[PDB]
Amino acid sequence: GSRATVFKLGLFKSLFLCSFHDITRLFKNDKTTNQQWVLAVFGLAEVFFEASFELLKKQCSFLQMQKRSHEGGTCAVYLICFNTAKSRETVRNLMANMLNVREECLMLQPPKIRGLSAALFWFKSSLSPATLKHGALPEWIRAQTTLNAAAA
DNA sequence: TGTATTTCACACCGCACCTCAGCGCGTTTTTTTTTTTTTT
Numbered sequence: 406g407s408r409a410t411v412f413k414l415g416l417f418k419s420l421f422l423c424s425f426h427d428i429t430r431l432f433k434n435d436k437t438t439n440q441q442w443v444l445a446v447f448g449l450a451e452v453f454f455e456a457s458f459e460l461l462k463k464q465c466s467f468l469q470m471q472k473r474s475h476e477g478g479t480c481a482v483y484l485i486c487f488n489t490a491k492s493r494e495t496v497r498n499l500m501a502n503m504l505n506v507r508e509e510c511l512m513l514q515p516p517k518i519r520g521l522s523a524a525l526f527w528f529k530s531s532l533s534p535a536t537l538k539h540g541a542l543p544e545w546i547r548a549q550t551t552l553n554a555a556a557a
Numbered sequence: 558t559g560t561a562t563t564t565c566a567c568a569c570c571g572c573a574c575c576t577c578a579g580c581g582c583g584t585t586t587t588t589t590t591t592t593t594t595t596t597t
Contacts, residue, residue, distance in 0.1 A: 436563055519570080 408433055408493065409512045413480075417445055417512075420473040420480045421530075427522045429514035432493070439515040440466075440490040441543055444483035444500060447510035454481050457503060458537035464488050468539045471530045484516075484527055486543045516545055524549035 414425050429443050449457075454472055462468050469484035481504075491499070493513045501508050517523045524546035530536050541547060 434563095 406435070407497075407509050407511055408435070409514055413445065413447065413510060413512055416447070416478050417480050417482070419477070420475075421471075421482060421526070423522055423526045425512055425514070427520065428516065428526050429523070430517045432514060435493045438490045438492040440488070441486040441516050441545070442496055442513055443516050444485055445510075445512040446481045446483065446500065446504050446506060447479060448506050449479055449481045449504055453505065455537075457481075457483075458539075460503065461485065462537075462539045465539075467541060467543050469527055469530060469536060469542075471533050471536050482530070484530075486516075516543070518545040518548070521549065 409425055409429075417425055425443070425445070449472075451472065454470065458468060458470055465485060465487045467484070467486045470481065472481050473479055485496070487496070497508065497511055497513055500511055500513075527542075527546050528550045531538060531542075542551070
């Protein structure tokens with residue numbers, strides 16, 4: 406299982422100071438699917454994180470990732486928006502064949518299309534040095550904080 | 558009898574359609590002007 410629990414959320418907050426319930430919202434139904442997803446993964450080495458942008462940036466319309474931390478536990482936060490929708494079990498198997506960790510530290514929920522912080526978080530992350538973007542941002546963030554007149 | 562594994566089923570919440578009429582809305586030199594021919 407390990408949909409999204411209080412423990413991962415606590416260290417997520419301790420690192421990026423914004424919740425996972427405020428960037429996504431709720432499904433405990435591990436059957437309901439979606440193409441877009443969010444993810445934060447724990448206990449990762451930076452080399453395979455940089456290679457994670459490498460590997461994933463085949464098959465998704467966008468991909469954002471950012472990294473921490475301070476001597477207390479690493480929370481590599483992803484933003485994943487695949488090409489064809491895949492369930493929490495399928496994307497769970499993908500990422501837990503990706504990151505050489507347990508099924509524990511996965512954070513799978515669809516992103517929330519109406520919400521301010523839900524795109525402010527990634528809009529701030531987009532300027533971070535270790536952030537790795539590919540192509541157009543998904544229409545949710547790329548709707549909430551952008552889609553504004555490029556040159557009036 | 559306990560439990561993994563999944564669409565229908567009422568609906569959060571909506572992207573975006575069509576639906577009205579109250580807001581904007583316009584031409585005027587040239588001729589005539591008294592000027593000096595214009596018979597006388």
